[PDB]
Amino acid sequence: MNIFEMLRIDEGLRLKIYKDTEGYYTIGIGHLLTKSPSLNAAKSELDKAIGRNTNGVITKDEAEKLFNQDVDAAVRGILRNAKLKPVYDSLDAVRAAALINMVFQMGETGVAGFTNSLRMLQQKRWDEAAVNLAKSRWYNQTPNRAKRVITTFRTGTWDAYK
Incomplete structure (x- = not known):
């Protein structure tokens, strides 16, 4: 088992925009989109992230992809x-x-x-x-x-x- 599997367990997988427990727009495997209350804003951040116009919906692969960036970022911060x-x-x-x-x-x-x-x-x-x-x-x-x-x-x- 590894960090990916572990986090996938901890974060779950959601292919449609959701709100984290602080009320922050989120998606996929714990990908925070924005701390703005504006749904327009998070949809816009998403499209930007995905590289396309998602309409707040992503595919399992797009999620796995953001997931990978997120994990990498977490490791870098630790290191920095x-x-x-x-x-x-x-x-x-x-x-x-x-x-x-x-x-x-x-x-x-x-x-x-x-x-x-x-x-x-x-x-x-x-x-x-x-x-x-x-x-x-x-x-x-x-x-x-x-x-x-x-x-x-x-x-x-x-x-x-x-």
Whole structure:
């Protein structure tokens, strides 16, 4: 299993414009279109993204394609990010996916704010990191995802996903 499969699980697949849980226009596999309340705006952002006039509708392939860009971007940010990189560097193939899942979900800045958990991970203090991550807003709010990702950092296995 890998980051793609994991996120596809976490984000689901929607081929028609939807609203994320903050009310933001979204599509596909967690592709945020715009933070504008204007549906016209998101449709316009979409067409721009796809390269065609979609009418707020995309194909599974178009989605997979945006998905790929998104994942790549998430990895780059981690890498451009100063708090992140060193953590990414200390993590195994599996736990690295988990980190990436968080960045994708909350953004560079968002993830870089888990100050204690990040040092704990950095130190390979799994359980404790886990213990602490569970004490977040993030987890309270998206407990299903949070839990899986937390179990991922703790075990270094795909169990929570199997």
